[PDB]
DNA sequence: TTATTTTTTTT
DNA sequence: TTATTTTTTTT
């Protein structure tokens, strides 16, 4: 039925079910959020609920409350008209869970009862179910649509008429009937996808124009079944279930591909298994295709010489946007001789990598130069460029940006006469400029100091390789990340989304396998919500109520298994008593090369020892083995030997054993997930399952139906709440390949690798030195095992390993019926890693706590030291670039202002209690408040600096080493500072300014402020040094209306060269060199240009040793006179 | 069958692409014995190219499009010297050849000339003895493009001033017609 | 020359008084129409026949082929 | 030295 | 006025 909202007119929105503790926790925290800025404000709420406490039930119940609240609102806001819908999403990585969760929500709508009566009437239940929509990938979306619906759509849009549609749809309409063959399914899926693209292309093509069919009734219902997004666009539906990858790619409606990230204002957005989404988003970012810069710039240069836009009022204003760009291209092409193609002079690849600050690296060891050989009309790359690449860039991006500005400019112009103008704008502009090749990149451009952080500046990777089929021309295929998955998540919050991250490990302290919650905490501030200690305690109590292991007498046994070589040798030679030796058997019968045999032994002995202990246990029947690797037919020899050992212990212990080799995910989906449960329901023998961590993260509730006739002796209810039971013994092989890697292409894999390296550097997990070596060796083709070397030395590796162990034993813990005794066999390598666990254990699973407590029964400092070097390195290379750009005569306004801003910040806030957002890495965090020690060469290598403890003797940055407290005692400077608000004394805070800032900027600026302070009261008037000589000197000065130019530098032939440079463009001038603080008794010196002493009438230059001892009023007076002698 | 046919065609293209790619370069597998027989069953043109077979049965449309061997798409029209060539139902082939000729795709001349004009201003070939003589072939063309672009103001795009199509037709002599 | 767009046309160029006849001079047809999604720019999409099927057949003979045209109406006067 | 199995969507 | 059903191969 087309049920109207009026069915809820008598519904009592106050009649909520009794809330479980988790619902209270969620409601409380969102209430707190609303208080702290929260109305019309985003949030992010990581929820580390353990699996089996009722995570999904809680989240779906929450989502249901949001639906009821929306309906309640719409019954009353009709006084305000129909507002924009408040969309609700549920996203997760895996399709199997999106569909499962949707079905659970519908089931909940069916059977939710309050005071023992069903909460919703049938028209109500149809109403709510109408609001929910589900958005699969295109191909499956097509295959869901019945033939009648799709034929109705084809008729309604008259697309029934044209041949290609009919042939294609006929073929697809056929294959459905024999899709029972999976092979048919594969072909059908691919073909259906292409059809869905073409079809929806034609629908929305007609819909944009006047050819649009007015949708209503049966045709509307047919389309809304074909295009579920149409229900959202027209407001029929407002709850959407979709995977993360669909969510990132957006989904079609009848007009255009609506993309949810662009429109999050007020959206509520439940993300299940939130930490897994870091990888999924990353896998989306790394798919970005490279653009050949050589081709791009030469094309732009060529086409922007003559090509003109028409002058008509249709787009009068646009062409002026391009004059700067056009001029830049001519300058650029003349500089680099873009007429000539490019070549190297060839077996090694040439690659460049850079984040966009301080971590620049190149493959070739020496400097890469690029010189035009006019005798060969070709630009050659030598080894003795990076500047050329950086400029071929920025011009390219500027082109895309100017394209954006011009397109919505054209939108303004035609609005003077709705998205339908977008495509005609882009094509009109590219056609006039004849730049039609770029149309793909132009479209993708729309979709793809200050707080500095990697997570929103990303990285840049450039590869130079010969074009296909040539030996004389190379391209520059630049690849980019503008952001990192944590940057995307923070942007989603800043656009106002409310995100709930339900995941048992949502706050794992890793930055590879989770978002960077240090960054998110910093950027979001108090929008990153968190569970108060009260709430965590309450959730812990509830968890104990649901899974009270202790009071019902469940015993958790943990043993750590070493390699036991003699044990393996005995069993192996029993498997082959006729053979020579055990290692012979590994080589001969098992196929293990002796290069691998030591490793395979250390592995297999632990596995077999765990198995034997399982078989000996009386009560246990269900052991799950989690290996890194799949024991399948490609390791069938090992399977046979393991089967032999199982048989031996089966006979010896007089218990039957069933072995499931090869339990990988496709086996689970296609063949045999259930009969492990069946075998538990029907037989007395024990079951051993061999599987992997990967094949269980994506996998069902690994449980079985209790057959009390077989197992009722060993099972207990552990809950105080169909009888089901779960895994009773687990073997946990140490997780191995923990670095992420992308299979999409070699380019995307490289982006994944560099993202991981830079993210580890971002946290201070790696010092900048280690991060550069790792980045470099990635350019030079690091082997995957040496990348794993580099990663294993971090502590982030420890946290990622503990994440997998915590998730593994959580997944096995769902049911509330347990054995008396649970056996946990852990690889001995995990003993130390688990021993290091130190987080608050209040939300852990009971199994994990057992693992930790058994292991223990036998780094912020490091992090802080590395971040000190990173902040110092970033300050030092950024100041070098900035100062060089000031000498890049003339200085831009922005550089000038940023220089004064840095100086003002350092003067006002030499220390701060919290690292400020806007100047986050002028400062470094000290282990000692107010001052710290460092050692390093400020002209030297930034990677070599060492700090607080590791340099007990070295330089010190402190209030005392800048003589500030001496300085402010002067009766002239102190009013000046206190008017300016500069800190006359350093607050003893943790965050202190970095050494490069201290030596280069702060002392210099402090001296300049002091000299201006004293001299101003003697009528010296100071003005900003003109932009044609900026910071070549400190201040241009006017005393008492004396007309000749005056110049200050504050603390000989080169300095004479600056002097001559000044007097070339302001004529004869007076130069004053003064140290603000020092010994005022020393003599004033009157100097020539070459700093040689001469008469005051000849002295263009004066050197003053000290103004402050006490004011050196004397030196002021002879300075006044020395000007008088002009 | 319909889906299988289309899919098999695309696979055959990609596959033979990779075979003859390797065969052109030093990566070429030396064909002999069972591998040769297997390829010659996959690529029947290989029997002709290496002289195993010399009688070919094929439709006119295949004959016009040529057929692959292990190295390149041999096209029979280019190599007819001494070929004997039985055509059955010869008069029907007029239509079939015509249907092949009419498939020729149009080239946008405005885009083509503006692209040529733009790129042939500065762009130079390298002077090395690898291809010493070539660049002199282009000086007349380059000069013509500059003359042409100046004559017709190719900087400016083109427009009419719109409901009727504008079409021109000409054989290349005396039967010129315009819409 | 940075003319990489033309690579398709360059490849197809290899494959595709005096005695005057249509059959080997062919025809030329040019259509001028607005580019997709614009109202201010037109293209000139030229189409060509260099020859006619009788011209192709005569070229095949001139390259030395020996052709047997078995057909019950091989010399229909059309 | 370290030692694998994995998802999703679109062209 | 004239008044339909058709093949083949490749991208």
Give the separation between CA A22 and CA A59, rounded to whole angstroms.
9
Task: Tell me which H or E stretch contains B141.
Answer: helix B139-152
Give the separation between CA A251 and CA A229, rounded to whole angstroms.
6
Give CA angle at A38 (A35, A43), nearest 5°.
Answer: 125
Nearest CA in chain A to C43: A431
- Measure, in angstroms, how far nucleotide D10 C1' is from residue A57 CA: 33
* CB contact residues (below 8 A), chain C span 1-40, against chain A: 2, 4-5, 35-40
**Strands A703-705 and A724-726, sheet pairing:** antiparallel
3-state secondary structure at position A26: helix
Residue A696, both tokens: 């269980």
DSSP assignment string, A76-106: HGGGG--PPP--EEEEES-HHHHHHHHHHHH
Contact residues for strand D with beta carbon within 7 Å: A 93-96, 136-139, 190, 193-194, 197, 242-243, 245-246, 249, 251, 283, 596, 598-599, 628-630, 664-666, 692, 694-695, 698, 736-738, 741, 743, 783-786, 788-789, 792
Q: Which residue has the tokens 């939710």?
A: A112
Nearest CA in chain C to A425: C38
Cα separations in angstroms, C43 against A1083, C13, C33: 83, 21, 6
Give the separation between CA A227 and CA A207, rounded to whole angstroms.
13
Give the separation between CA A190 and CA A927, rounded to whole angstroms.
59
Check B126 against A298: CB less than 8 A apart: no
- Which one of A424, A470, A473 would you mutate to disrupt binding with C, by most C Cβ within 10 Å of its Cβ? A424
Check B170 against C28: CB less than 8 A apart: yes
Identify which of A337, A345, A330, A346 has the alpha carbon closest to the alpha carbon of residue A377. A337
- Which one of B109, B117, B175, B178 would you mutate to disrupt binding with C, by most C Cβ within 10 Å of its Cβ? B109
Give the separation between CA A342 and CA A476, rounded to whole angstroms.
10
* Residue A891, Cβ density class (10 Å: 0-12 exposed, 13-18 middle, ≥19 buried): buried
Contact A296, A392 (CB under 8 A): yes
Give the separation between CA A155 and CA A150, rounded to whole angstroms.
9
The CA distance from A417 to the nearest CA of chain C, in Å, is 15
Give the separation between CA A277 and CA A272, rounded to whole angstroms.
9
Check C31 against B167: CB less than 8 A apart: yes
C35 interaction partners in chain A (CB closer than 8 Å): 427, 431
3-state secondary structure at position A125: helix
Check C38 against A437: CB less than 8 A apart: no
Checking B63-70 for CB contacts under 8 A at 24+ apart, the result is B64/B96, B64/B97, B64/B100, B65/B100, B68/B16, B68/B20, B68/B43, B69/B20, B69/B43, B69/B45, B70/B19, B70/B20, B70/B23, B70/B31, B70/B39, B70/B43, B70/B46
Handedness of CA C34, C37, C40, C46 (dihedral sign): negative
Half-sphere exposure of A27 (CA within 13 A, CB side): 12
Cα separations in angstroms, A718 against A204, A812, A813, A852, B56: 57, 15, 11, 22, 81
Torsion over CA of A816, A818, A823 and A828, rounded to 10 degrees?
0
3-state secondary structure at position A111: helix
- Measure, in angstroms, how far nucleotide D9 C1' is from residue A283 CA: 11
Give the separation between CA A338 and CA A955, rounded to whole angstroms.
50
The number of beta carbons lying within 10 Å of the beta carbon of residue A607 is 22
CB-based contact, A423 to chain C, within 8 Å: yes
Nearest CA in chain A to B123: A339
The number of beta carbons lying within 10 Å of the beta carbon of residue A654 is 8
The number of beta carbons lying within 10 Å of the beta carbon of residue A579 is 13
- Say which residues have a Cβ less than 8 Å from residue A925's Cβ, sequence separation at least 6: A864, A867, A868, A915, A990, A991, A992
Give the separation between CA A485 and CA A274, rounded to whole angstroms.
12
Give the separation between CA A838 and CA A753, rounded to whole angstroms.
29
B122 → closest Cβ in A188, A339, A376 = A339
Residue A541, both tokens: 């109590």
Handedness of CA A190, A195, A200, A205 (dihedral sign): positive
Report how many helices (DSSP H) and strands (DSSP E) chain B contains, helices first: 7, 6
The number of beta carbons lying within 10 Å of the beta carbon of residue A62 is 19
- Point out which residues pair with A1077 in neighbouring strands: A1108
Task: Tell me which H or E stretch contains A982.
Answer: none
Give the separation between CA A834 and CA A808, rounded to whole angstroms.
14
Max Cα distance, chain A (Å): 116
Cα separations in angstroms, A1113 against A977, A1046, A1081, A1104, A1110: 20, 19, 11, 12, 9
The CA distance from A190 to the nearest CA of chain B, in Å, is 10
C56 interaction partners in chain B (CB closer than 8 Å): 77, 97, 101
- Report the interhelical angle of A636-653 vs A565-575 (nearest 10°): 90
**Strands A724-726 and A932-934, sheet pairing:** unpaired
Checking B29-32 for CB contacts under 8 A at 24+ apart, the result is B31/B70
Check B75 against C48: CB less than 8 A apart: no
Identify which of A75, A67, A80 has the alpha carbon closest to the alpha carbon of residue A127. A67
- Measure, in angstroms, how far nucleotide D5 C1' is from residue A693 CA: 8
* Structural resolution in Å: 3.0
- Measure, in angstroms, how far nucleotide D7 C1' is from residue A96 CA: 11
Give the separation between CA A280 and CA A230, rounded to whole angstroms.
26
Q: Please list the alpha-helical segments (H only) found in A436-556.
A: 439-447, 485-494, 517-524, 533-546
Contact A306, B154 (CB under 8 A): yes
The CA distance from A140 to the nearest CA of chain C, in Å, is 32
Q: Please list the alpha-helical segments (H only) found in A209-269.
A: 217-226, 229-233, 244-249
- Which one of C31, C52, C74, C76 would you mutate to disrupt binding with B, by most B Cβ within 10 Å of its Cβ? C31
Check A428 against C38: CB less than 8 A apart: yes
Give the separation between CA A694 and CA A626, rounded to whole angstroms.
9
Residue A1084, both tokens: 């004033």
Residue A996, both tokens: 């490069």
Residue A885, both tokens: 């750009």
Task: Tell me which H or E stretch contains A363.
Answer: none
Identify which of A901, A854, A858 has the alpha carbon closest to the alpha carbon of residue A882. A901
Check C38 against A310: CB less than 8 A apart: no
What percent of chain B is helix, strand and coil (3-state, nearest 5)?
Answer: 50, 10, 40
Phi and psi at residue B25, in whole multiples of 5°? -90, -175
Report how many helices (DSSP H) and strands (DSSP E) chain C contains, helices first: 2, 3
Residue A1085, both tokens: 């010196």
Q: Which residue has the tokens 């190297």?
A: A344
Nearest CA in chain A to B150: A306
Residue A191, both tokens: 């073909």
Task: Tell me which H or E stretch contains A160.
Answer: none
Give the separation between CA A472 and CA B129, rounded to whole angstroms.
13
Check A436 against B111: CB less than 8 A apart: yes
* Residue A921, Cβ density class (10 Å: 0-12 exposed, 13-18 middle, ≥19 buried): buried
A195 interaction partners in chain B (CB closer than 8 Å): none
A341 interaction partners in chain C (CB closer than 8 Å): 2
- Measure, in angstroms, how far nucleotide E3 C1' is from residue C30 CA: 31
- Measure, in angstroms, how far nucleotide D1 C1' is from residue A850 CA: 32
Provide the positions of strand E that have an atom within 7 A of a protein CB. 7-11
C38 interaction partners in chain A (CB closer than 8 Å): 424, 427-428, 431
B90 interaction partners in chain C (CB closer than 8 Å): 67, 69-71, 74
- Say which residues have a Cβ less than 8 Å from residue A278's Cβ, sequence separation at least 6: A485, A486, A513, A514, A515
Give CA angle at A30 (A29, A31), nearest 5°.
Answer: 90
Give the separation between CA A535 and CA A24, rounded to whole angstroms.
9
Q: Please list the alpha-helical segments (H only) found in A40-162.
A: 55-76, 95-111, 122-131, 138-144, 147-156
Q: Which residue has the tokens 């490289």?
A: A750
B85 interaction partners in chain C (CB closer than 8 Å): 60, 65-68
* CB contact residues (below 8 A), chain B span 93-132, against chain C: 93-95, 97-98, 101-102, 104, 106-112, 115-116, 119-120, 123, 125
**Strands A459-466 and A350-355, sheet pairing:** antiparallel
Contact A1048, A1012 (CB under 8 A): no
Residue A88, both tokens: 């609700």
- Closest nucleotide C1' to the C-alpha of A98: D8
Give the separation between CA A1076 and CA A735, rounded to whole angstroms.
62
A427 → closest Cβ in C2, C4, C37 = C37
- Point out which residues pair with A88 in neighbouring strands: A239, A268
Give the separation between CA A101 and CA A57, rounded to whole angstroms.
9
Give the separation between CA A764 and CA B110, rounded to whole angstroms.
57
Cα separations in angstroms, C2 against A226, A298, A305, A466, C7: 45, 7, 16, 15, 11
- Point out which residues pair with A827 in neighbouring strands: A561
Give CA angle at A653 (A650, A656), nearest 5°.
Answer: 40
Give the separation between CA A462 and CA A754, rounded to whole angstroms.
12
Give the separation between CA A1085 and CA A1063, rounded to whole angstroms.
21
- Point out which residues pair with A823 in neighbouring strands: A557, A729
Residue A1014, both tokens: 């004293």
Identify which of A765, A775, A773, A828 has the alpha carbon closest to the alpha carbon of residue A800. A765
- Measure, in angstroms, how far nucleotide D4 C1' is from residue A584 CA: 27
B115 → closest Cβ in A308, A341, A434 = A434
Cis peptide before A890 (omega within 30 of 0): yes
CA-based radius of gyration for chain B: 24
Give the separation between CA A1024 and CA A1047, rounded to whole angstroms.
10
Nearest CA in chain C to A467: C4
3-state secondary structure at position B123: coil
Give the separation between CA A316 and CA A284, rounded to whole angstroms.
39
CA-based radius of gyration for chain C: 19
Identify which of A515, A444, A513, A516 has the alpha carbon closest to the alpha carbon of residue A480. A444
Give the separation between CA A556 and CA A729, rounded to whole angstroms.
10
Cα separations in angstroms, A400 against A441, A685, A1063: 8, 68, 44
Give the separation between CA A273 and CA A502, rounded to whole angstroms.
6
- Report the interhelical angle of B92-101 vs C53-62 (nearest 10°): 100
- Measure, in angstroms, how far nucleotide E10 C1' is from residue C50 CA: 21
3-state secondary structure at position A464: strand
Cα separations in angstroms, A217 against A129, A214, A222: 19, 10, 9
SS3 letters across A710-753: HHCCCEEECCCCCCEEECCEEEECCCCCCCCCCCCCHHHHHHHH
**What is the separation of C-alpha A1023 from the centre of its chain, rounded to a whole number of angstroms?**
46
CA-based radius of gyration for chain A: 36
Identify which of A1071, A1077, A1109 has the alpha carbon closest to the alpha carbon of residue A1010. A1077
Cα separations in angstroms, A11 against A76, A114, A993, C76: 13, 12, 61, 87
* CB contact residues (below 8 A), chain B span 154-173, against chain C: 157-160, 165-173
- Measure, in angstroms, how far nucleotide D1 C1' is from residue A789 CA: 6
- Say which residues have a Cβ less than 8 Å from residue A1096's Cβ, sequence separation at least 6: A1086, A1121, A1122, A1125
Give the separation between CA A52 and CA A546, rounded to whole angstroms.
8
């Amino acid at each position: 039925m087309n049920v109207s909202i009026e069915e809820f007119t008598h519904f009592d929105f106050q009649l909520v079910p009794e809330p479980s503790p988790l619902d209270l926790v969620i409601t409380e925290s969102l209430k707190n959020h609303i208080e702290v800025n929260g109305v019309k404000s985003g949030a992010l709420l990581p929820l580390p609920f353990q699996t089996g406490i009722g995570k999904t039930y809680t989240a779906l119940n929450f989502l249901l409350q949001q639906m009821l609240e929306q309906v309640r609102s719409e019954l009353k806001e009709e006084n305000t008209g129909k507002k924009s819908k408040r969309l609700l999403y549920y996203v997760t990585d895996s399709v199997d869970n999106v569909v499962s969760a949707k079905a659970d929500l519908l089931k909940l709508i069916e059977k939710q009862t309050v005071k023992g009566e069903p909460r919703f009437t049938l028209e109500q239940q149809e109403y709510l179910k109408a609001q929910i929509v589900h958005l699969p990938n295109q191909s499956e979306q097509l295959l869901q649509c019945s033939d009648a619906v799709l034929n109705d759509v084809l008729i309604g849009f008259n697309l029934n008429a044209e041949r290609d549609v009919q042939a294609e749809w006929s073929a697809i309409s056929g294959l459905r009937r024999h899709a029972s063959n999976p092979e048919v399914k594969i072909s059908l899926n691919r073909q259906a996808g292409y059809f869905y693209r073409n079809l929806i292309d034609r629908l929305q093509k007609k819909q944009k124009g006047a050819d649009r069919v007015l949708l209503s009734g049966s045709l509307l219902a047919s389309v809304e079944t074909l295009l579920p997004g149409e229900k959202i666009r027209n407001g029929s539906a407002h709850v959407a279930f979709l995977t993360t990858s669909k969510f990132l790619k957006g989904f079609h409606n009848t007009r255009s591909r609506y993309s949810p990230l662009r429109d999050l204002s007020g959206a509520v957005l439940i993300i299940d298994e939130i930490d897994k989404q870091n990888q999924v988003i990353l896998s989306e970012l790394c798919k970005q295709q490279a653009q050949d810069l050589i081709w791009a710039i030469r094309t732009l240069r060529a086409n922007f010489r003559d090509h003109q836009l028409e002058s008509s009022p249709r787009y009068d204003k646009i062409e002026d946007l391009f004059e700067p760009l056009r001029e830049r291209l001519e300058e650029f092409g003349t500089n680099w001789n873009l007429a000539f193609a490019f070549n190297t002079e060839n077996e090694r690849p040439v690659r460049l990598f850079s984040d966009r600050s301080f971590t620049h690296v190149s493959s070739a060891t020496h400097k890469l130069s690029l010189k035009s050989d006019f005798l060969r009309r070709k630009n050659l790359i030598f080894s003795d460029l990076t500047r050329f690449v950086n400029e071929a860039d920025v011009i390219y991006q500027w082109f895309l940006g100017t394209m954006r500005k011009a397109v919505f400019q054209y939108w303004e112009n035609v609005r003077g006469l709705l998205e339908g103008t977008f495509q005609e704008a882009v094509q009109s502009l590219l056609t006039h400029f004849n730049l039609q090749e770029f149309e793909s990149a132009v479209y993708e451009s729309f979709d793809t100091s200050s707080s500095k952080s990697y997570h929103h500046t990303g990285l840049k990777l450039v590869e130079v390789a010969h074009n296909q089929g040539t030996r004389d021309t190379v391209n520059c295929k630049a690849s980019f990340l503008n952001t990192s998955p944590s940057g995307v998540l923070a942007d989603m919050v800043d656009a106002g989304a409310v995100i709930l991250g339900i995941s048992a490990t949502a706050r794992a302290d890793t930055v590879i396998h989770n978002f960077d919650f240090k960054y998110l905490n910093e950027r979001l501030g108090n929008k990153l919500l968190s569970l108060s200690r009260e709430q965590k305690q309450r959730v812990n109590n509830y968890y104990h109520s649901r899974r009270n292991y202790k009071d019902n007498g469940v015993v958790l046994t943990v043993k750590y298994l070493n390699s036991r070589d003699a044990f393996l040798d005995a069993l192996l030679e029993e498997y082959k008593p006729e053979a020579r030796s055990s290692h012979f058997i590994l080589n001969h019968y098992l196929g293990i090369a002796e290069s691998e045999q030591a490793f395979v032994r250390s592995w297999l002995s632990k596995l077999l020892a765990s198995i034997k202990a399982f078989i000996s246990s009386p009560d246990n029947r269900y052991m799950l083995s989690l290996l890194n690797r799949t024991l399948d037919t490609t390791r069938q020899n090992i399977n046979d030997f393991i089967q032999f050992c199982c048989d031996k212990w089966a006979k010896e212990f007089n218990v039957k054993t069933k072995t499931f080799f090869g339990v990988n995910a496709d086996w689970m989906r296609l063949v045999g997930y259930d009969e492990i449960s069946k075998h538990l329901n029907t037989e007395l023998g024990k079951v051993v399952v061999f599987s992997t961590y990967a094949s269980m993260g994506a996998g069902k509730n690994p449980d079985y139906a209790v057959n009390l006739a077989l197992e009722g002796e060993s099972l207990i209810s552990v809950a105080d709440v169909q009888l089901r039971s779960d895994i009773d013994s687990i073997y946990l092989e140490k997780p191995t390949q923990l670095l992420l890697s992308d299979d999409y292409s070699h380019t995307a894999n490289q982006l994944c690798q560099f993202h991981q390296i830079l993210s580890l550097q971002e946290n201070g997990e790696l010092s900048p030195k280690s991060a550069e070596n790792w980045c470099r060796q990635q350019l030079m083709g690091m082997s995957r095992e040496r990348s794993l070397q580099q990663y294993h030395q971090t502590s982030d590796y420890q946290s990622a390993v503990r994440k997998y162990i915590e998730q593994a034993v959580g997944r096995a813990g769902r049911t509330s019926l347990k054995r008396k005794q649970i056996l946990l066999f852990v690889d001995s390598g995990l003993k130390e890693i688990l021993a290091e666990e130190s987080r608050d254990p209040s939300l852990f699973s009971h199994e994990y706590v057992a693992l930790v407590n058994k292991a223990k029964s036998a780094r912020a400092v490091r992090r802080l030291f590395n971040l000190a070097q990173r902040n110092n390195k970033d300050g030092m290379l950024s100041i070098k670039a900035l100062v060089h750009r000031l000498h890049n005569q003339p200085a831009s306004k922005s550089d000038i202002q940023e220089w004064q801003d840095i100086r003002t910040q350092l003067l006002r806030y030499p220390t701060v209690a919290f690292q400020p957002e806007r100047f986050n890495r002028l400062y470094l965090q000290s282990m000692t408040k107010g001052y710290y020690r460092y050692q390093g060469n400020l002209d030297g290598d930034p990677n070599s600096f060492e700090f607080f403890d590791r340099v007990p003797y070295g330089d010190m940055v402190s209030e005392e080493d800048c003589s500030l407290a001496t300085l402010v005692q002067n009766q002239y400077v102190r009013p000046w500072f206190e008017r300016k608000g500069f800190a006359c004394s350093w607050q003893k805070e943790a965050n202190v300014m970095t050494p490069i800032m201290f030596t280069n900027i702060y002392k210099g600026a402090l001296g300049e402020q002091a000299v201006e302070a004293v001299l101003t009261a003697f009528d010296f008037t100071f003005e900003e040094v003109p932009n044609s000589i900026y910071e070549r000197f400190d201040n241009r000065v006017i005393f008492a209306g004396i007309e000749q130019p005056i110049w200050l530098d504050s603390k000989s032939e080169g300095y004479s060269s600056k002097i001559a440079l000044v007097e070339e463009e302001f004529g004869p001038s007076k130069f004053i060199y003064v140290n603000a603080l020092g010994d005022t008794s020393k003599p004033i010196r009157y100097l020539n240009s070459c700093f040689v002493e001469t008469s005051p009438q000849l002295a263009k230059v004066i050197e003053i040793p000290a103004l402050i001892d006490d004011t050196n009023r004397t030196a002021v007076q002879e300075l006044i006179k020395w000007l008088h002698h002009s």
